[PDB]
Amino acid sequence: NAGKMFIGGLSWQTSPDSLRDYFSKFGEIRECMVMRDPTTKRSRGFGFVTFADPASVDKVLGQPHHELDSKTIDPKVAFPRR
Amino acid sequence: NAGKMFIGGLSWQTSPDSLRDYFSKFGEIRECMVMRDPKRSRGFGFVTFADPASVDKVLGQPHHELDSKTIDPKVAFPRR
């Protein structure tokens, strides 16, 4: 549904509060989660954000660069299928 | 939480129902979900097993394949 985004490339050290704190700069956030890639303890992880205002997604995508915990992260519109 | 796994590299071919059918052979599944990237090659799948034991059966099988693609199921530790 609306307002949801899937984010790739998170540092292995990025916490959910680091993910929430960065993305709060484009709007209020309903739900936020980080999932580690366990192939290594030093592997890039994945993030999920659910914005309160679905216009927040637009604000995110209008940036050319996104950086978090010194890694370039890759926010995408989420396309879930249960 | 427990009993969760994720799979990368899913083709557009693979339906959520196909993913569920694949992993149900290792045990009953509570949740199953696919996240596509539309850009023409590989999305992500998420499965929640009823019983954590089912994760051990997936990981004790060394080679996995789904809809022509080798897949590499991994334990998922989501943290909100």
Residue numbers in the entry:
A (entry chain A): 19 to 100
B (entry chain B): 19 to 56, 59 to 100
Question: Any passages from the paper?
Answer:
Musashi‐2 (MSI2) belongs to Musashi family of RNA binding proteins (RBP). Like Musashi‐1 (MSI1), it is overexpressed in a variety of cancers and is a promising therapeutic target. Both MSI proteins contain two N‐terminal RNA recognition motifs and play roles in posttranscriptional regulation of target mRNAs. Human MSI2 is a 328 amino acid protein that contains two RNA recognition motifs (RRMs) spanning G21‐K111 (RRM1) and K110‐P187 (RRM2). The C‐terminal region of MSI2 has no known motifs or specific function, while the N‐terminal RRMs mediate the binding to mRNAs,25 including those involved in the proliferation of certain cancers.
